[PDB]
Design a protein around this nucleic acid. Structure first.
Ligand code: SF4
Ligand code: NA
Length: 353
DNA sequence: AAGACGTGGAC
DNA sequence: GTCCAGTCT
């Protein structure tokens, strides 16, 4: 029904000619392939490249990552977003070392069991690093296959991904699965792009039903994103006479987990300075707050923070208890802060000067 | 199933 | 402004 060999030949030959020389493509070490694949989840290649180089220089082997402190690993991810990815990777490499002696499982079922590894990552790492013929369907590959085969099912449904995986299992080049899987990904990045695909240059134009019917710009089908909640947030920047600043570590469950922040309160529409003073008072801390110096927004995928920054002076009436920490200005650089709170500090320092 | 979960480009 | 670059729950 489908001329698989003709398709594979046109695809893999194109790939050998156009493949980009990306940093994680220098070899097939499973640890390096796995790190790159996790960083690339909902993150563009050009964004990842500098993070990857810095991460692998700090954590050159799987055992190095496993043996590192969680705060050092989070700092190496700082700014990349979706920070549970790195907490899950860190737990997963620890299990690979403790349990499997440091060798990344080559069994799909075993690799699939590690935290942060789902169907795409299983297929990506095992096909590239070990030759295992598991499909590696990400959103780009879903777009490619939805066009090639004129599939109009919503690609957000998990069932749709399962259908695409079966398609790949039938058309795959079982002789070189890693190259086949990489080539579909590279086709989606360089040719079969979300808007204005370059169908006239495409190596597999011969086999594309969407091109035949003239509807490539209309695939894949995907539900429009649900609007997000708006969340007002009040943030205190508190310094003592010696210049040190009060920061606190977020809880390990939920939004921006285990990152550091300036003390803050979801006002839920209430007065900021009032609610902020109640919260700090609950702790050795005597604090008087200033009028707000700036307000700005910060987007997440699922909500938007509306931040207002309030300066204040801290006088020590007791010890600073966890989760809080008193940090000299010169030491703040050592802590991993979300981008929102990086901006809080930037705005505080511009106002001060 | 569908919401939680960051951030930044390209239109 | 919209859309795009997976996994846990
Ligand atoms: S012909 Fe166009 S729509 Fe079809 S796979 Fe190639 S770039 Fe995509
Ligand atoms: Na998993």
């Amino acid at each position: 029904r489908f001329p698989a060999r003709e398709f594979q030949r046109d695809l893999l030959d194109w790939f050998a000619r156009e493949r980009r020389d990306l940093p994680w493509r220098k070899d097939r070490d499973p640890y390096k392939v796995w790190v790159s694949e996790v960083m690339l989840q909902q993150t563009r290649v050009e964004t990842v490249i500098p993070y990857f180089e810095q991460f692998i220089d700090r954590f050159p082997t799987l055992e190095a990552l496993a043996d590192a402190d969680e705060d050092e690993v989070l700092k190496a991810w700082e700014g990349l977003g979706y920070y549970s990815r790195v907490r899950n990777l860190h737990a997963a490499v620890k299990e690979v070392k403790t349990r499997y002696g440091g060798k990344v499982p080559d069994d799909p079922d075993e690799f699939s069991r590690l935290k942060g590894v789902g169907p795409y990552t299983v297929g990506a790492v095992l096909s590239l690093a070990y030759g295992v013929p598991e499909p590696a369907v990400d959103g780009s590959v879903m777009r490619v296959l939805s066009r090639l085969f004129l599939v109009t099912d919503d690609i957000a449904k998990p069932s749709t991904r399962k259908r695409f995986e079966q398609i790949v299992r039938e058309i795959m080049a079982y002789e070189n699965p890693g190259a086949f899987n990489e080539a579909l990904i590279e086709l989606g990045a360089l040719v079969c792009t979300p808007r204005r695909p370059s169908c006239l240059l495409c190596p597999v134009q011969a086999y594309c039903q969407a091109f035949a019917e003239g509807v490539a710009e209309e695939l894949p089908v995907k539900m429009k994103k649900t609007a997000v909640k708006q969340v007002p947030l009040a943030v205190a920047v508190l310094a003592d006479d010696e210049g040190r600043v009060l920061i606190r570590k977020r809880d390990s469950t939920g939004l921006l987990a285990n990152l550091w922040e300036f003390p803050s309160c979801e006002t839920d529409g209430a007065d900021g300075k009032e609610k902020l003073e109640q919260m700090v008072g609950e702790q050795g801390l005597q604090v008087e707050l200033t009028e707000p110096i700036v307000s700005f927004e910060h987007a997440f995928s699922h909500l938007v923070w509306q931040l207002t920054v309030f300066p204040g002076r801290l006088v020590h009436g007791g010890p600073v208890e966890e989760p809080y920490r008193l940090a000299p200005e010169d030491e703040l650089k050592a802590y991993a802060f979300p981008v929102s709170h990086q901006r809080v500090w930037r705005e505080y320092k511009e106002w001060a000067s």
